Symmetry: C2
Subunit: 271 residues, 2 copies
């Protein structure tokens, strides 16, 4: 950065509390959304997940504001912390910072999200029981263990009720994790509209990596070369017992249908 | 860059010869044009000015292609060397590489271009004579002075048209690049066959510097204004000298407008 540029930021740039936050969900495709959004000239985001509203609230809003990137007028300041979605005091705390805060939730088929979550935990703690084992409280009775975080996070409808007690539905956007993969430019169109940004991100910003199997950015923010998400993003899932899968799809179905109605959109996880 | 990404470039990436080149003009606003164009995801450009077709031609084509960035299918490879425009041998040589090469020329009011050129020379050698002194040979203007000769666009253009069809050339307005960046960039993207991505939101006007800056540069998440060397303060020039130079260029300017089919408005 040259003298004049730094000078501009020093003189006309300021640190703002985030006007929009990606609050969830874990494994929904939150890193992908944030990286794609960063391509837009009017988006500036914190690199790390702050975990302010859940883990470090006692440090204060001043500390939080301090983590934010210095922006120019017109640019939107954002942060993502997937765990907020299921944090009890989060809705109240964010509303306390500002009642007009916009919230983005990247959702995904509860079944594949649960398996994705498990896969990640398995890579960290390789000696844990199987997915089938953790899924049930009682296998033959078919009684699922809803206290297990992996299952719990996927009951979107219930968590959403918690948020709607502090925010109007109009201030929330529900992004399709599946479409973010099959047609990112398409999904980003909706996100840009929601954030009040001009639709700049388009098909030409993406390049499909056959080797990885997911789309990548033809040119990443702050770089001239492409950018595919790392090995940690797009982990291979273990094969799960067909019956266990049918049972979990059965468990989520009613909650999914409620979620479709609450959001006014059928995400297609139940056909 | 991470493993997966880097692997992708090594496997699917490849160096190409430039399909489009910014060939001029000196002080027209070439750095600004290239820096703005680099924001496009389908554009990859050489960082330095090659000076292949003019200065280092004897280094062979191998050396040239070496400097090119590794691109992905669909991405256009580009370079800028402002002095190509006035290089006699440039037209034939570039055509030899490929007669399908697209050429972009950023033009500027010949008078302000001349003063800008002088100002740059002055920054490198503060002891040179005044601009007014160098302008005249005797009311006879010293047309042999590079600062003046470079501005006779029509003359140089005739040389290029002996090797390229006018449709493979685009003349960008240096003045509009400043007043309406997105406007000129739109013309450029269309000419290069690239989708129109660069828009008004990509720019932020710097009141302190007096020029627009990129809100987000290609190689950064932060804004980017051109350096202190781009947008130099010009010395105050005698009105009579300015009048005589404008009168000198006018005939040539109007011819240039007819050749390119565009009135750049340097004479109204
Ligand atoms: N272009 C992309 N590259 C990699 N992963 C992507 C992606 N678009 C979406 N994803 C998804 O993002 C998930 C991770 O979400 P988060 O970033 O919120 O943790 C990955 O889960 P898997 O690893 O199970 O495939 C993957 O499915
Ligand atoms: N955004 C921008 N910032 C700075 N200079 C810019 C600019 N857009 C156009 N220019 C012009 O680009 C000229 C330099 O052209 P080049 O890069 O081809 O040498 C400058 O000449 P001055 O220094 O006389 O103002 C300036 O007028």
């Amino acid at each position: 950065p040259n003298s004049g540029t730094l000078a501009l930021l020093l003189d006309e740039g300021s640190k703002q509390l985030p006007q929009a936050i990606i609050i969830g969900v874990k494994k929904g495709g939150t890193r992908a959304l944030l990286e794609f959004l960063r391509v837009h000239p009017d988006v500036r985001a914190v690199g790390a997940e702050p975990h302010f509203f859940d883990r470090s609230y006692d440090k204060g809003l001043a500390w939080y504001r301090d983590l934010m990137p210095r922006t120019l007028d017109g640019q939107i300041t954002m942060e993502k912390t997937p765990s907020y979605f299921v944090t009890r005091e989060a809705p109240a705390r964010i509303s306390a910072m500002s009642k007009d805060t916009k919230l983005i939730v990247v959702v995904r088929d509860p079944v594949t999200r649960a398996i994705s979550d498990y896969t990640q935990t398995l890579s960290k703690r390789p000696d844990i029981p199987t997915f089938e084992s953790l899924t049930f409280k009682n296998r033959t009775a078919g009684l699922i263990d809803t206290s297990w975080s992996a299952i719990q996070i996927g009951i979107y409808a219930k968590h959403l009720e918690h948020w709607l007690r502090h925010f109007p539905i109009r201030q929330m956007l529900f992004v399709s994790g599946e479409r973010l993969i099959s047609d990112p430019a398409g999904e980003l169109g909706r996100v840009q509209d929601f954030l009040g940004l001009k639709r700049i991100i388009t098909d030409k910003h993406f390049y499909f990596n056959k080797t990885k199997g997911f789309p990548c950015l033809k040119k990443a923010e702050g770089s001239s070369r492409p950018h595919c998400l790392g090995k940690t993003k797009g982990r291979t899932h273990p094969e799960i017992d067909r019956e266990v899968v049918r049972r979990l799809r059965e468990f989520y179905r009613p909650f999914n249908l409620k979620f479709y109605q609450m959001t006014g959109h059928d995400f297609g996880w139940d056909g």
